[PDB]
Design a binder for this molecule. Structure first.
Ligand SMILES: O[C@@H]1CCN(c2ccccc2)[C@H](O)N1
Lengths: 300, 304
């Protein structure tokens, strides 16, 4: 009985708004007296290929920005651009503003996404930053302007904003300061995501989760050296494993008594021989969207 | 296409977050649902540690007065003014009506249908997940220590349909519970006596809708050229522990059948080949597993 969970989305729900520039409509994040949204909302049908965003920006008037929060309309006062994020300053501060911080995450860390359409929240899901810096999600998993977040002691950490739907069923976007995740541009040009890989630290964290839940058949008597594991793992499209990840797994190593490189011999053996029709925590597949600290959060 | 790399989503939990409270009777603390002037919670909050095998709820309840119930809404304390029992749900009338009460209904679901769960510690929401009422009337849930009182719901046009409440963890690691009228799902009792869940089965109708969703989005490698009779399909499915398929499930799938031009029974023959051959490393809609927790209602709603 181990299931993936998203954060309670209430505190982010009361921040989504609908931003409309000319013909284009998408989601905004209304915080204090500022609305954040992707900067490509200003792209016309003629600049949508090769725009000089800051010069296009300075020529738009505030009045070309429609902002509604449900039935209420918001007054745009000014606008500035920070990287690929548009910042529209409004006359009203959001009284539903949670306590928040802007953070940037690393490939392999998890967060929840509140999927929104035209400002209206539609659903919520947990995901991980893929090593190729993309996030799994169809057009039905929330369109441009939806945000990704973690909650740390009732404080929201916004880390992600959806910008564009890639052809491969994944989407890409930025942090809330506008910097893209991965080698992507907000220009409607042919663009492809790199070959993905399995988040190796997360699989080990998930294997520790099985051991906490008494699922133990995969554990063996063997260890392995770090790179004697890495060599085998990259041949299966697994992320190489750094000394940082080992340390991060330390606390789980101390609760279960399974050294990190011991569990690495279990996973390495799982890679070459498969699960032989057995199961771990109910799944015939290895999960890699549980960080070490999602396990400690949900198991302590 | 539309649903390439599609993920299940739980509904936004905000409207439920504003209804969760902490209910305490003596030494037990669990979650309550505060809707208007009444808070709902599982009745086994009034059990002691000796009462858990054969609790006499009617004896236990009548011995309790309003001021033995400790209802905490965040940082305010609510005053209990009345208290009655409807099956296994306890109902605490409070003097103060929840301002954050959403539009809501109480509905009972059938196995195979889906909803979201807001998992809570001590009145405090901890997470949200999307799941299905399994065919054996249990909920494969999170390894949360005291989720009792966590509710399940769907949301449809600002209106929250409450359909589940968590009462107990079973030895098999899944959860069992009631509707908001206190009737359990399945043959379970709110007693700490030996209770086992029947053998789980794959929600066949859900898989077929999922397979129809793939075909809508050009994912097409699993289709074959065969049809099957309904009863020839049902007979093979069962030795793979798949739910038998009823004519009603065939009708439910009819809209998917017409938009793709693939007869339902043809899709059943394609499924039957997937069972004898398997998905060993291959993907359907980005998933390396056959999804059985996405209903035909959400497929046709989301793929018009
Ligand atoms: O999940 C656990 C298991 C079941 N539950 C319980 C307590 C008293 C009588 C019957 C059931 C307990 O409070 N919570």
């Amino acid at each position: 009985g181990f299931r993936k969970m998203a954060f309670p989305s209430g505190k982010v729900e009361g921040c989504m708004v609908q931003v409309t520039c000319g013909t284009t409509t998408l989601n905004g994040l209304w915080l204090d007296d500022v609305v954040y949204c992707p900067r490509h909302v200003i792209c016309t049908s003629e600049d949508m290929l090769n725009p000089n965003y800051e010069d296009l920006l300075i020529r738009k008037s505030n009045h070309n920005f429609l902002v509604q929060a449900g039935n209420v309309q918001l007054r745009v006062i000014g606008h500035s651009m920070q990287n690929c994020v548009l910042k529209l300053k409004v006359d009203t501060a959001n009284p539903k503003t949670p306590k928040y911080k802007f953070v940037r995450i690393q490939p392999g860390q998890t967060f929840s996404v509140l999927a929104c359409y035209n400002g209206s929240p539609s659903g919520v899901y947990q995901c991980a930053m893929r090593p190729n810096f993309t996030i799994k999600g169809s057009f039905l998993n929330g369109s441009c302007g939806s945000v990704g977040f973690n909650i740390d002691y009732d404080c929201v950490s916004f880390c992600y904003m959806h910008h564009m739907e890639l052809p491969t069923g994944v989407h890409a976007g930025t942090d809330l300061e506008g910097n893209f995740y991965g080698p992507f541009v907000d220009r409607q040009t042919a663009q492809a995501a790199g070959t993905d890989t399995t988040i190796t630290v997360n699989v080990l964290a998930w294997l520790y989760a099985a051991v906490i839940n008494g699922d133990r058949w995969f554990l063996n008597r063997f260890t392995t050296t770090l790179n004697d594991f890495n060599l085998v793992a990259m041949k299966y499209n697994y992320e190489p494993l750094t000394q940082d990840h080992v340390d991060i797994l330390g606390p789980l190593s101390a609760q279960t008594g399974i050294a990190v490189l011991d569990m690495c011999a279990s996973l390495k053996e799982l890679l070459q021989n498969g699960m032989n029709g057995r199961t771990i925590l109910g799944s015939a597949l290895l999960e890699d969207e549980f960080t070490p600290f999602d396990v400690v959060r949900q198991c302590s």
